[PDB]
Design brief:
Blueprint: H1 11-21, E1 26-33, E2 45-53, E3 56-61, H2 66-76, E4 82-84, H3 88-99, E5 107-108, H4 110-117, H5 126-130, H6 148-173, H7 176-196, E6 198-200, H8 202-227, H9 236-240, H10 268-292, E7 293-296, E8 301-304, E9 331-333, E10 337-339, E11 351-358, H11 361-370, H12 373-379, H13 385-394, H14 403-417, H15 422-429, H16 433-446, H17 448-464, E12 466-468, E13 474-476, H18 485-522, E14 541-542, E15 546-548, E16 551-552, H19 556-569, E17 579-584, E18 591-592
Parallel strand pairs: 1-4, 4-5
Antiparallel strand pairs: 1-2, 2-3, 6-8, 7-8, 9-10, 11-15, 11-16, 11-17, 12-13, 14-15, 17-18
Helix pairs in contact: 3-7, 4-6, 7-18, 8-10, 11-12, 11-17, 11-18, 13-14, 15-16, 16-17, 17-18, 18-19
Bound molecules: 2'-deoxyguanosine-5'-triphosphate (DGT) and magnesium ion.
The protein binds a DNA duplex through residues 236, 253, 255-257, 276-277, 280-281, 284-285, 309, 312-321, 323, 325-329, 411, 414-425, 428, 485-486, 489-490, 492-494, 496-498, 500-501, 505, 543-546.
Amino acid sequence: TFSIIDVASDRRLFNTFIKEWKTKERYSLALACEKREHDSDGLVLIGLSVCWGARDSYYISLQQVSERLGQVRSCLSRPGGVVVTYDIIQVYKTLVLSCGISLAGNCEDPKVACWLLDPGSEERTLPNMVTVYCPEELPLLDGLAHCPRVRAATKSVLVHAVMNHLTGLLEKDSMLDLFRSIEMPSQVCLALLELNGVGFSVEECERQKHVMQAKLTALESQAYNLAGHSFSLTSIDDIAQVLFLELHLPQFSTTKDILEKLRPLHPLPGVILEWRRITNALTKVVFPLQREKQYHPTLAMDRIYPIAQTHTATGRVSFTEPNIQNVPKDFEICMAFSVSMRHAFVPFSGGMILAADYSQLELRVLAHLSKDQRLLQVLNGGADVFRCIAAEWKGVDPETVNDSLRQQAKQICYGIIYGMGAKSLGEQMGVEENDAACYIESFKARYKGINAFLKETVKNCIKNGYVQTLMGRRRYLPGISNTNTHIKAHAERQAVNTTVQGSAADIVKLATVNIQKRLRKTYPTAPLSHQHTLRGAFFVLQLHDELIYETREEDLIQVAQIVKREMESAVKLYVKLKAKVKVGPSWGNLQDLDL
DNA sequence: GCTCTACGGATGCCTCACAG
DNA sequence: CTGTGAGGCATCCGTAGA
Ligand SMILES: Nc1nc2c(ncn2[C@H]2C[C@H](O)[C@@H](COP(=O)(O)OP(=O)(O)OP(=O)(O)O)O2)c(=O)[nH]1
Ligand SMILES: [Mg+2]
């Protein structure tokens, strides 16, 4: 019954297809691109194929008129009417960049359902899905020359069948409400983030690169003079020589975090550390971005377009190649220059970067999950828990806690929460093994609800094989009952961390979706992204709790109000989700906006 | 006895042509 | 006949963000 009839061949047939399509509560949509060139209509994208069910596929050719594209735009932009596509983000970007079509409404992606049912598994290709979840369609795998009219039909029907199976599988696991309402709208928001791209000035990048390269030459001159000869800084053998071979205390694994008893006294290891950061910064941001930089003519600027992965074990969002998330924070260079690779990321003319970062997000989520009344009452009163942790660690007043010293407190807190042992805590605090063990013991005793939550999460993981987040995501950890102690402990730490961190990721995704909905309510006429062609915000980057939006100068205040309200009202918990909003002329130049 | 990501570089065995 | 350099991947680790 596998049919590939072409609806876009007759006027009346196409009209009947459209009128039956607008009433379909759930259909499957597939791209059909004959990519003769690497983002066009009739040259790259050839058409769209549809599938309502019962092994039926209808093809809408975008080749040799525009009324078909107009009606497809009407159907795809809020015709119920859930459209399921394979790799929704790339499909959304292709539709936008080829025809300016925005998928508005309810969208679904079988990859997202497969990753919900097994976050730690491998990213199943569509045939891999048909060979696992829906074996009853294997003979249809033939059809993926490519002939994008047949590959699209086969992909659409297979995606429809696979998503129908995954719908029942999610209903069994009680993830369908989370999948339909939170996971997929977050994917559409990430597609909008990829379409927008983050602004990027080469002029700032060029001057930062020039200063960094001058510093690299100076550092090489120092290192070749500090030791006595001219070695190679990119080969581990040379660093394992001189250091650990002449005077320094230890093949030898010359890496970071051995700063103790090495970086003091002889200053060579500090120079090597600075050289390695600046070199990593260059070769992983500056060079990759200066070759991945693209020119937006309408904005008359340069933009970096990242690619989101979203197949994360804990529910986070990552980015490949450009790695805008991993762009380093500002660091100082002495003769003093300030390498701010984020400062190279800029809004359009007459616009401002707006960044809203969740304040102690995972602490609040852990307080809600554990129902720990102590933590709840501490963090509902406006107190900064990380500041107090740093203060009690160092004995200084909490109001005088450095941001760098607060990062160590954050690391200590989250590590203790997520299974850090006594040796690692001693390393990260400088205290002895016994002192670190007593610190973890008193931490669990003080926050009784948190320790009870950890033990109960481990026990329920052993009983069920999986852990669950605040909004229903399950991660299966078969190693929880493994006989080997190391694997069992790793699975325990992963279980607790997945619970809390996946809950935080769910909260962040829902906050992003709510912000986007409110922004579209407030600015219905604004463009959805920078590739749809001003007013509103644009969501140029996501930092796992932080949302960079790149708003207009006059709309800054209203956008900040909207963003703060939505990030605080995303989910109703026993905690308050205090969001910290900053604005500035650049990503690397942001000032706190107490609004 | 922190977790997550990507990613490149590094190990670390497994196997195949191969030259003796 | 057979060790074997080489290659061939398969993962592990370090490092930057979070
Ligand atoms: N296990 C672990 N998770 C971390 C660590 N640093 C950050 N994370 C996770 C937990 C945080 O809730 C989440 C968001 O990142 P941030 O570092 O910006 O922290 P948060 O928003 O919690 O606090 P702050 O923003 O400083 O008030 O990242 C770390 O050192 N260890
Ligand atoms: Mg934060």
